[PDB]
Amino acid sequence: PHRYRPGTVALREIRRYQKSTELLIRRQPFARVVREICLLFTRGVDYRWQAMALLALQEAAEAFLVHLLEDAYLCSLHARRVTLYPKDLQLARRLRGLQGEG
């Protein structure tokens, strides 16, 4: 039968996903996570969330994650590797810390 080589399918995914602008995380689970975190922070008070606020939060989180993964893969390529590794994320967050953390 037919079977693509390992890697030539991920390139198509990269090209497809750098072209579109739709959100990548499922909407409902992200809203549930946001509600849980807000409830845990506010200690039992039920706060209502607008429809637009969840969307804005999801957009910001997705952009931040994409940029962080870009920097992590930059580090991985610097280390003479093509695989993203957990230490790469830690190094990327360390190089742009308290100034860029917030």
Binding site: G7, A10, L11, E13, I14, R16, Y17, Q18, L24, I25, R26, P29, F30, R32, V33, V34, E36, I37, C38, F41, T42, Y47, R48, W49, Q50, M52, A53, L55, A56, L57, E59, A60, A61, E62, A63, F64, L65, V66, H67, L68, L69, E70, A72, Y73, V82, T83, L84, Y85, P86, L89, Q90, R93, G100, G102
Partner: protein, 80 residues
């Protein structure tokens, strides 16, 4: 099923693909979930503080905008 597991492996893979990542290790997902959790914690705490100062019992999309702007990442398209 814990909520933080709602961000599944395919979602992180798609985010990495948008980020240019070609190959992904099996231990990336937990670290990414932790980073997302801490970012959400910070932003949501700031937004809830902004809302509570306004004597409101529901948070709006504008309060998230001020929270993100204060944290350092200005956001465009939601009023300011």
């Amino acid at each position: 099923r814990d909520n933080i597991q709602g961000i599944t492996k395919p979602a992180i893979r798609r985010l990495a693909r948008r980020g240019g990542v070609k190959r992904i290790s099996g231990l990336i997902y937990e670290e990414t979930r932790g980073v997302l959790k801490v970012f959400l914690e910070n932003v949501i705490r700031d937004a809830v503080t902004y809302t509570e100062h306004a004597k409101r019992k529901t948070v709006t999309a504008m309060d998230v905008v001020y929270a993100l702007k204060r944290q350092g990442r200005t956001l465009y398209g939601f009023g300011g």
